[PDB]
Amino acid sequence: TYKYVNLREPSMDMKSVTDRAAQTLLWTELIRGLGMTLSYLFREPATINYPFEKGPLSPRFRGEHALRRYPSGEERCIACKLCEAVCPAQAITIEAEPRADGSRRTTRYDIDMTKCIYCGFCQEACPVDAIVEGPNFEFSTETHEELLYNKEKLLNNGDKWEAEIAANIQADYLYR
Amino acid sequence: MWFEVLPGIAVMGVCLFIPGMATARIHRFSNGGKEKRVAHYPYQWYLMERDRRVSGVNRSYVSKGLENI
Amino acid sequence: ASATRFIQWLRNWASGRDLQAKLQLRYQEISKRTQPPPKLPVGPSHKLSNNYYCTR
Amino acid sequence: MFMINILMLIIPILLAVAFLTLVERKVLGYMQLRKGPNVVGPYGLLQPIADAIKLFIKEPLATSSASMFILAPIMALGLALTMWIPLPMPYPLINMNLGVLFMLAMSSLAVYSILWSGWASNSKYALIGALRAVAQTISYEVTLAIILLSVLLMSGSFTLSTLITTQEQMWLILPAWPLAMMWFISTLAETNRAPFDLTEGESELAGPFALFFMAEYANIIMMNIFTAILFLGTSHNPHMPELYTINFTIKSLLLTMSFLWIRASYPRFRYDQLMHLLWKNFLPLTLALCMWHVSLPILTSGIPPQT
Amino acid sequence: NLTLNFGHGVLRLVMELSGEMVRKCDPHIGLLHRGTEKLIEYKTYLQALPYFDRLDYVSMMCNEQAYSLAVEKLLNIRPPPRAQWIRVLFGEITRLLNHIMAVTTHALDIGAMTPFFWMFEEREKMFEFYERVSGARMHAAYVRPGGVHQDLPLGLMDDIYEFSKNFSLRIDELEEMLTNNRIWRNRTVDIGIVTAEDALNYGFSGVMLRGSGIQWDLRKTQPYD
Amino acid sequence: GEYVVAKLDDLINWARRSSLWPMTFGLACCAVEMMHMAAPRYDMDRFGVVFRASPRQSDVMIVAGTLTNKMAPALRKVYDQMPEPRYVVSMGSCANGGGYYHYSYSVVRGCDRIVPVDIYVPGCPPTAEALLYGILQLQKKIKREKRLRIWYRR
Amino acid sequence: MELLQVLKRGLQQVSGHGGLRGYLRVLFRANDVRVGTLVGEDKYGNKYYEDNKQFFGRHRWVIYTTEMNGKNTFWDVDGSMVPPEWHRWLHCMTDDPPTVKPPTARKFIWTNHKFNLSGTPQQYVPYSTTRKKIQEWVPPSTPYK
Numbered sequence A: 001t002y003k004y005v006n007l008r009e010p011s012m013d014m015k016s017v018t019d020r021a022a023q024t025l026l027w028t029e030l031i032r033g034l035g036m037t038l039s040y041l042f043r044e045p046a047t048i049n050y051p052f053e054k055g056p057l058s059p060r061f062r063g064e065h066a067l068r069r070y071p072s073g074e075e076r077c078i079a080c081k082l083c084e085a086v087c088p089a090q091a092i093t094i095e096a097e098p099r100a101d102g103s104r105r106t107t108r109y110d111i112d113m114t115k116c117i118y119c120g121f122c123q124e125a126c127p128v129d130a131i132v133e134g135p136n137f138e139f140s141t142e143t144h145e146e147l148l149y150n151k152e153k154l155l156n157n158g159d160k161w162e163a164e165i166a167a168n169i170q171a172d173y174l175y176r
Numbered sequence B: 001m002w003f004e005v006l007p008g009i010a011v012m013g014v015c016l017f018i019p020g021m022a023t024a025r026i027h028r029f030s031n032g033g034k035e036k037r038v039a040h041y042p043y044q045w046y047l048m049e050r051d052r053r054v055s056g057v058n059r060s061y062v063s064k065g066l067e068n069i
Numbered sequence C: 001a002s003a004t005r006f007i008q009w010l011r012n013w014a015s016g017r018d019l020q021a022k023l024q025l026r027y028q029e030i031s032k033r034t035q036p037p038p039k040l041p042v043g044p045s046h047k048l049s050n051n052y053y054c055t056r
Numbered sequence D: 001m002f003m004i005n006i007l008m009l010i011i012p013i014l015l016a017v018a019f020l021t022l023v024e025r026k027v028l029g030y031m032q033l034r035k036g037p038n039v040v041g042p043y044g045l046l047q048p049i050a051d052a053i054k055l056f057i058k059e060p061l062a063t064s065s066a067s068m069f070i071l072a073p074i075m076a077l078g079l080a081l082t083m084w085i086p087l088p089m090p091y092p093l094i095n096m097n098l099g100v101l102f103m104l105a106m107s108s109l110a111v112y113s114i115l116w117s118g119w120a121s122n123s124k125y126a127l128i129g130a131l132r133a134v135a136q137t138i139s140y141e142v143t144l145a146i147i148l149l150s151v152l153l154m155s156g157s158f159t160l161s162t163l164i165t166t167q168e169q170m171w172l173i174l175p176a177w178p179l180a181m182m183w184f185i186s187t188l189a190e191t192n193r194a195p196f197d198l199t200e201g202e203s204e205l206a207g208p209f210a211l212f213f214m215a216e217y218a219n220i221i222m223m224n225i226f227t228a229i230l231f232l233g234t235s236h237n238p239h240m241p242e243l244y245t246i247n248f249t250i251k252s253l254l255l256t257m258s259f260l261w262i263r264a265s266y267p268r269f270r271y272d273q274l275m276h277l278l279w280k281n282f283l284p285l286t287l288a289l290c291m292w293h294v295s296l297p298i299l300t301s302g303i304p305p306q307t
Numbered sequence E: 001n002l003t004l005n006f007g008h009g010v011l012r013l014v015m016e017l018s019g020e021m022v023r024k025c026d027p028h029i030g031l032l033h034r035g036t037e038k039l040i041e042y043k044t045y046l047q048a049l050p051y052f053d054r055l056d057y058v059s060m061m062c063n064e065q066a067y068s069l070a071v072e073k074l075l076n077i078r079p080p081p082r083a084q085w086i087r088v089l090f091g092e093i094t095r096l097l098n099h100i101m102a103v104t105t106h107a108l109d110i111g112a113m114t115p116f117f118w119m120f121e122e123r124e125k126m127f128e129f130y131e132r133v134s135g136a137r138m139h140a141a142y143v144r145p146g147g148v149h150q151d152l153p154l155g156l157m158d159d160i161y162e163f164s165k166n167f168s169l170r171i172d173e174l175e176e177m178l179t180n181n182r183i184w185r186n187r188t189v190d191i192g193i194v195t196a197e198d199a200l201n202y203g204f205s206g207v208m209l210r211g212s213g214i215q216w217d218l219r220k221t222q223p224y225d
Numbered sequence F: 001g002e003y004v005v006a007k008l009d010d011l012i013n014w015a016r017r018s019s020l021w022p023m024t025f026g027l028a029c030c031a032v033e034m035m036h037m038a039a040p041r042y043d044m045d046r047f048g049v050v051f052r053a054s055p056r057q058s059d060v061m062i063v064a065g066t067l068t069n070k071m072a073p074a075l076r077k078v079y080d081q082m083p084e085p086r087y088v089v090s091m092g093s094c095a096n097g098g099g100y101y102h103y104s105y106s107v108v109r110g111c112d113r114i115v116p117v118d119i120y121v122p123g124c125p126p127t128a129e130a131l132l133y134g135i136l137q138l139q140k141k142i143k144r145e146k147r148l149r150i151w152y153r154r
Numbered sequence G: 001m002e003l004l005q006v007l008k009r010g011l012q013q014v015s016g017h018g019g020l021r022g023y024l025r026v027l028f029r030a031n032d033v034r035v036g037t038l039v040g041e042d043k044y045g046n047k048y049y050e051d052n053k054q055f056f057g058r059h060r061w062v063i064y065t066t067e068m069n070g071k072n073t074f075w076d077v078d079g080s081m082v083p084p085e086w087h088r089w090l091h092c093m094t095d096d097p098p099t100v101k102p103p104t105a106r107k108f109i110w111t112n113h114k115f116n117l118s119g120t121p122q123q124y125v126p127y128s129t130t131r132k133k134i135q136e137w138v139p140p141s142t143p144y145k
């Protein structure tokens, strides 16, 4: 099914011709345009008062990465490297060895935040909810190097943001 | 809200009020409290120059009336 | 939604529309930001029998 | 005493221009469902000061002729301030018997700043942009002069303060609204304002910059003050001249604000299309209305006094 | 004939002018060539999906849909019906996103800057729908071969209904600014006329075809989902 | 002496950070979130950050998207024509360090190979709010400058 | 007249912010003199307000503390100053504030939130976290060629 956007015949009677003459000479449609912008002048603006007010986000938001712990404090990551394998940007670099107590743990866990496309595949792939994209988006830096996260930075992010990260996972894990 | 546009409009309006208000009050101060005399044509300049001589102080805006008759 | 009646009349007349019925700012009509948990359904392959992969 | 009077005109003009940039940004913002400057000082009242300081300590970034590179902004700003000295508000700084002709004569010189800066640009493409701007400006000078003459056939003289007397009973916009319409549009095109802002349009398809900007925005205010006097005459009470100044300022502010309103409302003309608007539309009507306004006072026995 | 070396991304146009008239236009592209097609050969089919968000990065989820359909066709599998409806639902939300960008930036480029601001507040609200289902405002990576990544959160459909309920008025406001404006019509009427036969031979599609009267829309003739 | 130099520094810093005019290099998708930062919700103009400034009137270059090898010379040329003081904001993974296209034969692995960068905004794309946070971070960097104090001590 | 009720609404905001000085303080710190309901306050001094008659996005806001972690933040406020427990509420990731739904406690969670430390001596510096891979032979310390 189709419709014509612009296939109409102007009425050529004197009244219609004189109507178009009045529009040409008295700029009626241009004045009608002035009314629209005038009505917007008197509308409340849509602006929010950042940083005192923030745009709404959802629990699914993909922000800065973090490495999480179990309630006991043990790391969740067991160096399976599924995140590293799935990473579309190859932003993740992992090395692992047996820990001094025999645990399977990483000795290197780096995310190049300037390679990362913030896609969330890593946190989908992870079988133990170890790597997550947290809610933080306000972490711009003055140098390139500060955006090359090693494991200490990522564990610190997890300890810094775990209160919010856990609550967001609680809200969304039934959709996963 | 739109009425937050007013303070900038108020400052602009006060800036444009000053020239006209200043000229009018400077004219009164310089012309004995009256409007500054307009002389666009030779006849009006002739009367103004005659007023200057008649004033006795060389000021065309100092008027002499029947007291000088 | 906070405009005085005079300003509401003024902008409705200037636009030619009843703007107050369809405000472009959102108020209480939007859904709550906390929702009850979901309970999602499972697909057709979620069966305990008659479900051999070679038939699907 | 007179030097004080000159400064009580020059200084407020520059301050009014500074805060028109804030008003323009905020009026445009609210018509765009946003706020415009509101952080740099309460309600953005310090924004013009921050912009002004910023521009003047910016690196002043070769000219094809140093004399003309410096002449062009001096001419622009000097001429712009000069257009104000005969304006009656209600009393002019200088009371000229031919004040209307003086403003016409001085405004015709403003196109030299465009021409000289194009010559000094040292770039073939900037000179061509300047010549296109000049052709637009002189084209709309034609209708402005003829419209002005038509109105003065009801006033009787070239004295600006006589327009006040002519409109003692009634604004001239009522007998001359067709001329008021073309006059208003002509001022927009004359000041390269949207939808006639083709220099800034076509172009994208520090202190010296600030100086040209001040000259243009002073001209915008002045043109709308001229429009208020020409068509919306305020009544003058000689014992309370401030009453005239308040009413006449409000009209000029509203006319200036309608320049911003129009910028917010329409797309841009093509260059050839704004040339046709003048040569094929405005000029024919202006010529016919010039004949009409020559005949009308004679045929109604409403010829104004010479003085 | 003067030669102008310069006259969405970044484009380099080399033009030949005879006064006001354009005699030749030579677009020089590749300023955003990033070898996506070669990069995809080093990715699994899932790893390649986010590359499609970044092609026509105004119509992210439609690019995802095209790639997902292609992979689903080679896989010989079928996405479930609810996934198909979500994909059509967000396909059309994405069309609104694109057409707002297309029309108002087209207007903004020729001086009509104001509808851009009114309609980009509507885009901002559709970005929230993207972010709510996927966690990202733009590059959702939501539509995948086999369906979609996650089900809709509870309450989303109500908010889409609220947005849709008011949107046609926003189109009306846009039309009041442009449709009958004589300046807008002067800039667009009889500009870039293309014949039906020329459009087909030059490989045009979409509105570039239908504007010239060709009755063709893949959603009608070769439907999917 | 010290007091005057300090107060004058505060004044020029306040003027420069309160009137930041950006030249935006809208290279790719990050340019869309920059448009959303100008859009009504965030209204960058309300901070004194005008929507679009000419390169010769600009104080900050925002590199919003992938910088290809073919484009790199042009970007450097625009940077060199900027009047000082000039700052560069790198927006998004592509400009930060190549991002999704880091290993491509045609892509510069970070705009900081071409120009010095003052602020790096992460994200693919950063949200409009994230970019605004970055612009405000640049404002704070400008507030820390002590050009006149260092000049006085030369 | 309506303009009368608007004007008294403006005056109430002066007393709603504890007089002229408090009113001017919020005007210059935050460019906003609205009065909302106090939802709570965090350990750093940030105060959180709500007003559900405002349109979505303006219905929640924070007045940042004037001092955090030894930094004077009277003028220099930052979005990264919001601690995570209030971050969820302020961004409308949830409906209920931490004063009503406190976060779960863990011994490893930071007790003291930190804002963005870029450009300071506390900034993060990357380094390799792995040990040396190849051990070089060390020659003997006694002469014996």
Ligand SMILES: CCCCCCCCCCCCCCCCCC(=O)OC[C@H](COP(=O)(O)OCCN)OC(=O)CCCCCCCCCCCCCCCCC
Residues within 6 Å of the ligand: A024, A025, A026, A027, A030, A031, D178, D179, D180, D181, D182, D184, D185, D227, D231, D262, D266, D277, D281, D282, D285, D292, E182
């Ligand atoms: C009894 C005896 C009587 C004798 C006297 C009779 C005379 C009166 C009757 C005649 C009325 C004359 C009206 C004169 C106004 C000028 C009309 C005009 O020129 O409009 C035509 C022009 C081009 O029209 P267009 O559609 O593009 O194409 C036509 C040619 N092809 O279209 C345009 O000009 C469009 C203008 C473009 C600019 C747009 C921005 C302006 C929009 C806002 C304008 C607001 C009004 C201005 C008010 C000023 C107040 C001071």
Ligand SMILES: CCCCCCCCCCCCO[C@@H]1O[C@H](CO)[C@@H](O[C@H]2O[C@H](CO)[C@@H](O)[C@H](O)[C@H]2O)[C@H](O)[C@H]1O
Residues within 6 Å of the ligand: D052, D053, D056, D057, D058, D059, D060, F008, F012, F084, F085, F147
């Ligand atoms: C309206 C009245 C305003 C009164 C304000 C008075 C303040 C006086 C102190 C001004 C200090 C300006 O500070 C300085 O400005 C110049 C403008 O080019 C900048 O630029 C300058 O330095 C850079 C290198 O740093 C040079 O390459 C450049 O050629 C030079 O112009 C400096 O980077 C900035 O440090």
Ligand SMILES: N=C(N)NC(=N)NCCc1ccc(I)c(Cl)c1
Residues within 6 Å of the ligand: D018, D019, D020, D021, D022, D024, D025, D047, D048, D049, D051, D052, D055, D210, D213, D214, F050
């Ligand atoms: N076009 C606008 N209205 N905004 C804008 N950025 N204007 C230019 C800014 C400006 C220029 C000179 C001075 I002196 C001042 Cl105070 C401000």
Ligand code: SF4
Residues within 6 Å of the ligand: A083, A086, A087, A088, A089, A090, A091, A092, A111, A115, A116, A117, A118, A119, A120, A121, A122, A123, A133
């Ligand atoms: S978000 Fe995507 S690109 Fe970034 S580290 Fe995770 S998988 Fe890699």
Ligand code: SF4
Residues within 6 Å of the ligand: A076, A077, A078, A079, A080, A081, A082, A083, A084, A094, A122, A125, A126, A127, A128, A129, A130, A131
């Ligand atoms: S973060 Fe998860 S997916 Fe990645 S290596 Fe650790 S356990 Fe495996």
Ligand code: SF4
Residues within 6 Å of the ligand: E054, E057, F028, F029, F030, F031, F064, F065, F066, F091, F092, F093, F094, F095, F099, F100, F123, F124, F125, F126
């Ligand atoms: S960083 Fe992401 S959003 Fe920005 S240009 Fe690159 S791919 Fe596009």
